[PDB]
Amino acid sequence: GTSNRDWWPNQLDLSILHRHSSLSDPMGKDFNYAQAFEKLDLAAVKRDLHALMTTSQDWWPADFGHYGGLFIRMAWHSAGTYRTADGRGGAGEGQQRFAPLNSWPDNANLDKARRLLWPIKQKYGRAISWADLLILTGNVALESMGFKTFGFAGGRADTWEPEDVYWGSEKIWLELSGGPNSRYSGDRQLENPLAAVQMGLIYVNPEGPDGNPDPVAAARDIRDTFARMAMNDEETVALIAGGHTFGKTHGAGPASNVGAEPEAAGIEAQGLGWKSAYRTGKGADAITGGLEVTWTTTPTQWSHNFFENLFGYEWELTKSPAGAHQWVAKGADAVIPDAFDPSKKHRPTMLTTDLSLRFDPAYEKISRRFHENPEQFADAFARAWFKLTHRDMGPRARYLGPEVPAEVLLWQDPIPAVDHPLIDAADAAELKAKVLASGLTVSQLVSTAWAAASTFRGSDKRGGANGARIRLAPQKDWEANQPEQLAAVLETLEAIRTAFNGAQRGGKQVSLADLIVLAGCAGVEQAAKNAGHAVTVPFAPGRADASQEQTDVESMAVLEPVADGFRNYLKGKYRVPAEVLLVDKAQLLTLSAPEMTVLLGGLRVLGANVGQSRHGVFTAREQALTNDFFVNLLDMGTEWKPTAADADVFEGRDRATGELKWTGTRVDLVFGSHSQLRALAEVYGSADAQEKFVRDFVAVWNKVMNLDRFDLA
Amino acid sequence: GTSNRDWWPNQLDLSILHRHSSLSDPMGKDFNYAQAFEKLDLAAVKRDLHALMTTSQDWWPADFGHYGGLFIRMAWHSAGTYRTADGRGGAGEGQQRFAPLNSWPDNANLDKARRLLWPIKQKYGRAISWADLLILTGNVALESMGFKTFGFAGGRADTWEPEDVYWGSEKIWLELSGGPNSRYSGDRQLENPLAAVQMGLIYVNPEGPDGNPDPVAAARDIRDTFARMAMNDEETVALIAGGHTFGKTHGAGPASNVGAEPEAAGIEAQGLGWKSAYRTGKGADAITGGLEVTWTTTPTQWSHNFFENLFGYEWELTKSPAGAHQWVAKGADAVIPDAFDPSKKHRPTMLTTDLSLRFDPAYEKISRRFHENPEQFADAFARAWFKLTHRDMGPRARYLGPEVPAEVLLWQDPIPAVDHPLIDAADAAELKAKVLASGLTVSQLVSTAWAAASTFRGSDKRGGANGARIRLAPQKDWEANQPEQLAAVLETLEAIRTAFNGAQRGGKQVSLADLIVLAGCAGVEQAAKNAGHAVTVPFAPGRADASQEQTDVESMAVLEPVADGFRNYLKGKYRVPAEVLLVDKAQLLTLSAPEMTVLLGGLRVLGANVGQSRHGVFTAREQALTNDFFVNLLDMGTEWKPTAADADVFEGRDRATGELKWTGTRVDLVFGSHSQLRALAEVYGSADAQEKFVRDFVAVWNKVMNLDRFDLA
């Protein structure tokens, strides 16, 4: 059946905003996963997982009698899709069990690993999510094999449909770079937001770049991809050598023996895939990725044998039984055990990308230090494994259970505890009046609070107004945030704050993070007043102020908005049309299409545009909260044309006289073009809509202000 | 950006069950359109519409100074997408304003028509839907031009995103038959559920079949497509001749002048399309469909001139200025007015498909009768226009406002009014005990109520248990309904009924329609008890029993389930895989995917399969309401393979011994295969889920039993 996507393949896709409705969720509307998890007997779960590690099933026999390696790779892959550019991917939604990730070639035979876990998932039911279970199982694997983990937090709620994620434009799995949809350009520059080198890989190609088995060049791909997954050199070497302390690869025969990935397999395969015609198709005959490497002499026990081997031998380029490039230790004895036959042994082997850790000079220094000091290695790996597996979980307040680490890590964007009474409703009212009396405008107040709160992204739950990080480097200098104007607003609010906190008794005080948000609230109330409407904008106190020392400035860089349609802002010229970027931002903000529409139309008339641009400011009463954006946008008395100076800016002229009425961007005019968005604009542009527009605006404003407020969950 | 649909294009699509969530709806959760409409000043709306008729806008000037013809075509097209096969299409959801319908070639320049209505829409806001407004406008157009309509009903709630409808498989607009995705096979057999001859047409090609200008052959396509849109010969002739009493076609120059349809046009076009480079691109120079025909001497006034012209001249084949085939009256004077130039007149013209009304022998007789008896023509057209425009509105209870016709029409599947007291909770308890004491089994009770209630489809709001039509022809003879078993259950229920009604005082009585549903409820209660659960199933009385004379047997045929996965039924071998048909049925039933899943799993263990098939009956306690379907389906101790005798049936064997445990269909096993459905099955197959399963099943059962209950809305 031909669909709208077939006829109009470049049209914007709003369905990405409407996933995760109560329609697709089997749990009741009131189900609270945190409450279910908090009563799980986590210790009992772990004991079952521990027993599972050495209980082999004949449909996928355990290598060396121990599934530990398989499960560690499973957990690593669950986490390893994460990209810092957008926060998308990661383990936090259990997306490995859905398309496309359940069928990525790099996830081959993890369908078996997930299936091994059904009996435990079935036992404990809604009290442990798949998302939590994947990571937990990886921790229990490492613990069972002698490795002390840094901790574990529950709280990743299950999701019930695939996320809409851009994974690249290629139409062939694993396509080598340089094709018609190449994700590389210039001098091996990977396009943002991607964080893998080929479609369907987690990070890099284990043979080397586009299959070229050069460890030095592979190292460049390793470093780039792992940085784009939030990991530095030390963390990267710790993770790869730590992982490859365990288990083995699977490449026992040619890959052409391996059948359809799960989403393409027949219905009788019951959600599994990659069925192999090679000998028994499993166990000793397994084929997963096509390499045949076993790193250590004790693949089911933590050791420092990965580095002993890496540095204790010289390596020769060889081929697996499937034809893949890999490396074997020159002159070595057969000291590596076989996974099924106790009378066979093998020489040490390595991937090209393992050798990267020795032949790249910066990695070499770290690998050497870890080799000489394996306790350093163990600590770095534990910390990195925790970071890896929790990177997308959000604020520490979301972390559940008895194994949460007490140490606060810089990468968490930590927020200090609040240790005083909070302001009450009367205090809030007093503060809003003092804000409005200072002479700060609706435009300043709205813009500042928008800038602070709208860094939040639901993808990894980073950002938001909690912390008052807008007053710190680097947020205070981002162009979208209007640095000079911001500095003036923050100076006024800080003087108001100092004066309020100085008059209190009893320890009550207000954080600047709360006051920024409250001041925006006051601005929205004043704008409503300016339009002849008395409304109260809800406000919840309890944010705290983080320090510069608690703020990693480089990690913060990925939250810079280079495109923010809600402020009519685009930092440069991109390949993706601005309206697509608007919908992408709305998704990150967790907005629906109605919420996006209301919010943008309100912001336009409140003066929230960067640089006071008149684009989309379709009103003669700016700073009054009215539906004028919609009524004027939809007025058929106005004709629109692109400008000669810029195809992305449009002039709205009176159709009869030619007089210039307005200018707008693509982000403005999409609301009058896109058939679904224009239907939403019509509701808010109707003569009966002023009350609705105000109410719905206030509601979405408050939703945005509270996006990071997991302390109130 | 490559998507799951690109990688796995034949995978089932569940998003069709989750469209129309509260996320995409701008109205609040409690918005009730009926209540808004009942407060509309309908008379004021009609006055505005009357004014609009002759208020020409320069951006799309009115032909003859009157937009009545354009609006009539607009309403006719809104309604004209309807297919009796699935009840999809029609005017009842205002889908003409969304893709793909807003951009169909046959809807060219109806974008202008809808835009002319914006000011009225804006004025009256949520109190008149677009869906109602399109039809109302068409009525006002007819009234303005002198034609008295049969009535009008409001109540078509607006929808907020495109429906997922199969409109065909062609990848080229207007593709002629016989291509790689032909909708025709055999001797010009149009594939079900389609009701148009080419992709993007309403019914037929106005030039003739695949462009061949033979009116006799065109008549065959007219008859088939209009029958597939619920219209017989009389109604068809009346509608086409009635419609073509007004207005004109537009084909002033070559079609190559016409640019992109709305979904493809630039953002500056602000939701319009088909901008034309021919002369002024509008008005006298309009190009819509490429023909250049004006039927009558008074195109803005009701007349009897259509049949005078059809029969009063002989016709000659000619070409329009765009090159399309059309017909001109031989020897005629220039009697037809020009739409813009008072000094020009034209000869009478006709489409090939107009000539069909004279040259097909069955139409000729009707056309003659209408020509000789114009009052009969007028009355038939009024009734047919009412039917056309209300066909998908459902039961009369949904009809709103002061212009609803009092006459009850056969096509409405009418339900008699209830004129006596209803049974109360004590009576219900007594009737359920009598049902359970009669010896009717859980299987019989469930299957009967399922067969009665599950004929409902939300697409056109036909079917459901109200009316007790399961006891009449043709439902009582459908194979899916197990006629012999049904007749035995109905005889026992009728005897219960007769005995209860005979013991009453007052006029209290129970309809058979209510008792069928109540008896089903007792069966579910019994099944729950058999499993050890104490469950009361909700029941709402008030259904009435329709007569055979109130049940058009031919119109009922399209509700016959030829595929019903909920009873593991398939009447023949189809090209569409059965699990796609299951999702289709769920959509018609208004079910989400979690609802579909719970319902099917319960039905399987209750004995609702046709013929008592064991396929999917994954329990050793049939007739007890348990989650056994899920627990056994997901058991990895069973391996599944298609049978050698039939690729669509699967055997589930013990993995270790090879012993046969179960058999299933595609519909059964899709729940263990499709990654989203399996995630739902897991919830219900978990150790903590038995009570949730039972409660969710009761809820969905009740939902199905009440689908047609608009008397309680």
Ligand code: HEM
């Ligand atoms: C450059 C980065 C990495 C590359 C190219 C890579 C490559 C691979 C390959 C090709 C396999 C074999 C798949 C199969 O045939 O079964 C594998 C196995 C494995 N990897 Fe990695 N890996 C990388 C990083 C990591 C990380 C960061 C971890 C965890 C901290 C990890 C843990 C494992 C484990 C435990 C196995 C063994 C699985 C088993 O025993 O079934 N790897 N790796």
Ligand code: HEM
């Ligand atoms: C066999 C069925 C029919 C065919 C092939 C057909 C064909 C067409 C075509 C080709 C046009 C010209 C479109 C354009 O260039 O502007 C048209 C116009 C129109 N048709 Fe039909 N038609 C059919 C049935 C109907 C019916 C059932 C109605 C309403 C009851 C209707 C009412 C109209 C009216 C009023 C117009 C004039 C539009 C104007 O004045 O702008 N037609 N028809």
Ligand SMILES: NNC(=O)c1ccncc1
């Ligand atoms: N692809 N996923 C996201 O963008 C997202 C996920 C959860 N909340 C907001 C956004």
Ligand SMILES: NNC(=O)c1ccncc1
């Ligand atoms: N395409 N539309 C339908 O199938 C439908 C619409 C409303 N309720 C049930 C089904």
Ligand SMILES: [Cl-]
């Ligand atoms: Cl994601």
Ligand SMILES: [Cl-]
């Ligand atoms: Cl539809």
Ligand code: NA
């Ligand atoms: Na994420």
Ligand code: NA
């Ligand atoms: Na319909």
